[PDB]
Design a binder for this molecule. Structure first.
Ligand SMILES: CC1=C(/C=C/C(C)=C/C=C/C(C)=C/C=C/C=C(C)/C=C/C=C(C)/C=C/C2=C(C)CCCC2(C)C)C(C)(C)CCC1
Length: 134
């Protein structure tokens, strides 16, 4: 389980967009009210602002939405990130680009994360999204 922190640290060394790409592809290889609430504030924005929030959450930017995120529990935070992925498959959230290919480093992490067990993956994801926001 020290290997989980290494995934988190490796994940946190990538570019912000690279991080979001890795998170999205993992989603393709696979408290709710509070999450649905924050999720509504997201899809109520313009598609561009939807992108800037997710970046701002990874960058720990200090704004109102990041503060709300940062004030939630780990479970809610991860559920929020799930509803974002669902909102993207349903075209509710700004879509993901087809022509994006993962860096050599990212594809290594992904296959490495494909090796972990479902519960270690959940543990990984919770720790990755837990310190985001403000
Ligand atoms: C590419 C790019 C972009 C974008 C991107 C994005 C936007 C992404 C996103 C991504 C995402 C948005 C992702 C997500 C993910 C999610 C996930 C991965 C989730 C998971 C979850 C889970 C795992 C859960 C579990 C559970 C529950 C539900 C609760 C408790 C119990 C259990 C455990 C069952 C742009 C446009 C700028 C362009 C350039 C770059």
């Amino acid at each position: 389980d020290p290997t989980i922190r290494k995934y988190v640290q490796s994940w946190q060394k990538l570019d912000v967009d690279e991080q979001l790409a890795l998170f999205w592809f993992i989603y393709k290889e696979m408290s709710p009210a509070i999450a649905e609430g924050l999720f509504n504030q997201v899809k109520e924005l313009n598609h561009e602002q939807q992108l800037q929030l997710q970046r701002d959450l990874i960058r720990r930017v200090d704004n109102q939405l990041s503060r709300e995120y940062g004030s939630l529990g780990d479970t809610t935070k991860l559920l929020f990130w799930y509803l974002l992925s669902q909102g993207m498959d349903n075209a509710t959230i700004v879509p993901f680009p087809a022509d994006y290919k993962l860096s050599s480093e990212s594809q290594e992490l992904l296959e490495g994360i494909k090796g972990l067990g479902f519960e270690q993956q959940i543990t990984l994801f919770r720790d990755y999204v837990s310190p985001m926001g403000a």
